[PDB]
Amino acid sequence: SDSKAIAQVGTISANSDETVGKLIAEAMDKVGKEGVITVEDGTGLQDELDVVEGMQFDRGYLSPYFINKPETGAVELESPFILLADKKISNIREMLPVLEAVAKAGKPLLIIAEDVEGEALATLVVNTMRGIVKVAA
Amino acid sequence: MNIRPLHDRVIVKRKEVETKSAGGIVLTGSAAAKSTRGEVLAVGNGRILENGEVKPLDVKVGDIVIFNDGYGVKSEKIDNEEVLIMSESDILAIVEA
Amino acid sequence: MNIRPLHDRVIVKRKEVETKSAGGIVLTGSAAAKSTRGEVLAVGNGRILENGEVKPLDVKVGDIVIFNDGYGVKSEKIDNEEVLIMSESDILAIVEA
Amino acid sequence: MNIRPLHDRVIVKRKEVETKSAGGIVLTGSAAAKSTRGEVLAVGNGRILENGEVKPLDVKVGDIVIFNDGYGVKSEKIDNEEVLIMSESDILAIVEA
């Protein structure tokens, strides 16, 4: 149960490599008991441990224009309103109520669904631009 | 040079296509649509149907009106500006107040 | 700014699409259908056919009615609201009592 | 609430589709067909064509009639019942005797 012992088995398993058990022990000590752990090939020659905090997934933004502060496509919608759907939004752009409802509150907005066409994005770009509604999906 | 409609025929000019204001604050981008409103510029005498008399048109020059952009409507370049030509028939209503 | 039809043309507003209550207690979900009832808002002068005179419309501003949403029916946004425009033609009946 | 037709427009209700009694004793199942008979419920004022006057309808409220269930025929739910709407045009004859 202690991190020590755990480091010992990892180590022993990895043909006596302390670095391993050490690392592993750490990971477990972090992600927890039901925390997930996976191994991939590293860039450098040193072993490296990355730990995701909170909620996150493998999806990038469709509206590259909607980058908040930092680069690399970094968006940082401060105090947003998350939105979830079950379909794409080509010209189904109809929904401005919901939209304008926040343009009202003046809070950033995050979106999720089957997808989103430029029709929505386009307008979305200049809205968030003009300072109408800081958003992206 | 300016024009002169041919009775029944009315010369108008559309307006702003999908003006960014819908939804209130929402700056509605042009999602591949057009405008139906326009202004009265020229008025044909009046329809000449049924021989007996030639009925005047219910639209005074300059009126703000809503129309059905259909086939009967055409386009021309007057003084290098877009203009529309349909019959009073095509004109649906009028914007007031 | 409000509207003004153009004789014969009647301005209306549809109602609640498949309102949940049919079948009695049954909360009927919107099975991809639309509404046919509406409320008269504006009334054009009256038909002008057959030259002689211009016959009025049998519908007073406000009537609750049922129409055939055919081709002739169009849509617009006045003050940011959905409105329909057809000729008295399309109107079939008026809900009363 | 009940309905009020709009001149020329007649309100009726169909009847028993492929009622089992054909061939005499034979109980004819519904081989995928419909009914053409119905009862008059509401009568519109009367056609208004050709300006001059507004001709009444040759169909009193309640008649038993046969009609061509075509396009001009529509459907509606009144008090939660099926009802059809066509012009006297669509009506062909009246079951008497």
Side-chain angles (χ1 to χ4, degrees), chain A residues 1-58 60-65 67-86 89 95-99 101-129 131-137, chain B residues 2-97, chain C residues 2-97, chain D residues 2-97:
Chain A
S1 64
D2 59 72
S3 296
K4 179 183 180 183
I6 292 183
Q8 288 175 163
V9 311
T11 300
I12 200 75
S13 179
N15 192 176
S16 310
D17 184 311
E18 303 176 54
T19 309
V20 185
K22 164 58 186 172
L23 200 56
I24 299 181
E26 299 188 55
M28 307 198 67
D29 171 61
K30 226 68 172 183
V31 299
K33 308 177 183 181
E34 296 183 59
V36 190
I37 306 181
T38 52
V39 51
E40 310 161 355
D41 298 305
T43 56
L45 306 191
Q46 318 84 304
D47 313 305
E48 185 183 307
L49 173 55
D50 297 352
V51 179
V52 178
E53 284 293 59
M55 190 60 180
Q56 174 203 64
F57 57 45
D58 51 300
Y61 58 7
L62 298 66
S63 65
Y65 312 68
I67 296 180
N68 191 294
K69 179 187 297 66
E71 300 55 56
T72 309
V75 180
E76 297 189 296
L77 307 184
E78 182 58 300
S79 175
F81 282 111
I82 302 62
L83 180 48
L84 306 72
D86 289 58
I89 303 71
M95 57 135 297
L96 297 67
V98 188
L99 186 183
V102 184
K104 177 290 179 183
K107 291 289 68 179
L109 200 304
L110 179 291
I111 303 73
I112 305 173
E114 259 60 359
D115 189 55
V116 180
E117 280 57 294
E119 180 270 47
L121 306 169
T123 168
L124 173 59
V125 184
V126 187
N127 288 299
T128 63
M129 260 65 288
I132 310 173
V133 293
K134 299 192 300 65
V135 189
Chain B
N2 78 300
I3 30 57
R4 177 51 187 172
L6 223 296
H7 58 61
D8 167 53
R9 287 296 184 183
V10 190
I11 295 177
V12 295
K13 64 181 302 181
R14 185 185 296 78
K15 305 190 66 176
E16 305 309 292
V17 171
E18 291 175 294
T19 298
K20 298 68 185 303
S21 60
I25 311 176
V26 183
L27 181 162
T28 171
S30 186
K34 201 61 173 296
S35 175
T36 60
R37 286 66 185 306
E39 178 187 296
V40 184
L41 312 181
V43 183
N45 309 304
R47 188 200 311 174
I48 306 179
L49 290 182
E50 195 169 304
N51 189 59
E53 291 72 293
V54 174
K55 53 263 65 184
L57 292 174
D58 302 58
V59 297
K60 65 196 64 178
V61 181
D63 297 313
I64 295 182
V65 304
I66 299 180
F67 63 71
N68 171 295
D69 194 310
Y71 178 55
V73 186
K74 320 301 176 178
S75 177
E76 282 288 303
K77 207 70 172 182
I78 290 58
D79 300 303
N80 199 299
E81 282 73 60
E82 283 300 301
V83 291
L84 301 64
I85 309 176
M86 62 289 286
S87 65
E88 183 185 65
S89 304
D90 294 350
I91 302 181
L92 300 172
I94 296 182
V95 188
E96 307 174 306
Chain C
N2 81 302
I3 24 59
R4 177 55 185 172
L6 213 295
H7 59 65
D8 174 62
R9 284 302 191 178
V10 186
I11 292 177
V12 300
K13 60 180 301 181
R14 182 178 299 79
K15 299 192 66 178
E16 304 310 295
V17 181
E18 288 176 294
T19 301
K20 301 66 184 302
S21 61
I25 313 175
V26 183
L27 187 167
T28 165
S30 185
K34 202 59 174 296
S35 174
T36 66
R37 284 67 181 306
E39 181 180 300
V40 181
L41 308 182
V43 182
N45 319 312
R47 185 193 311 180
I48 302 178
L49 282 177
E50 193 170 299
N51 188 58
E53 290 74 295
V54 179
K55 52 259 63 178
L57 297 179
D58 296 61
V59 298
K60 62 195 64 177
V61 179
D63 299 306
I64 303 172
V65 302
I66 303 174
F67 59 70
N68 170 292
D69 189 309
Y71 178 49
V73 186
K74 317 301 174 180
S75 177
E76 278 294 304
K77 206 74 168 185
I78 288 56
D79 304 301
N80 197 300
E81 287 70 63
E82 282 305 304
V83 290
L84 302 67
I85 300 179
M86 66 291 292
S87 65
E88 183 181 65
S89 313
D90 301 351
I91 304 180
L92 307 173
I94 295 182
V95 183
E96 306 177 303
Chain D
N2 74 301
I3 33 56
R4 175 53 188 174
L6 220 299
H7 61 60
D8 173 64
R9 282 303 189 180
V10 187
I11 292 181
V12 296
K13 63 180 301 179
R14 186 183 294 80
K15 304 189 64 176
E16 308 312 293
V17 172
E18 289 178 297
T19 300
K20 304 71 186 302
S21 62
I25 311 174
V26 185
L27 184 161
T28 166
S30 192
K34 199 61 175 294
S35 176
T36 58
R37 282 67 181 308
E39 179 189 303
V40 181
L41 308 176
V43 184
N45 312 309
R47 185 198 309 180
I48 304 183
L49 285 180
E50 193 172 299
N51 178 61
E53 294 68 292
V54 178
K55 49 266 66 182
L57 298 175
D58 302 54
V59 298
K60 61 199 67 180
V61 179
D63 299 306
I64 293 179
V65 300
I66 299 176
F67 61 70
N68 172 299
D69 190 311
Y71 180 59
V73 185
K74 317 301 175 180
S75 184
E76 285 293 297
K77 207 72 171 186
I78 286 59
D79 299 301
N80 200 293
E81 290 73 61
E82 284 298 300
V83 290
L84 302 62
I85 301 178
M86 63 292 287
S87 61
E88 182 185 69
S89 313
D90 295 352
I91 305 181
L92 306 171
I94 300 184
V95 181
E96 302 183 302

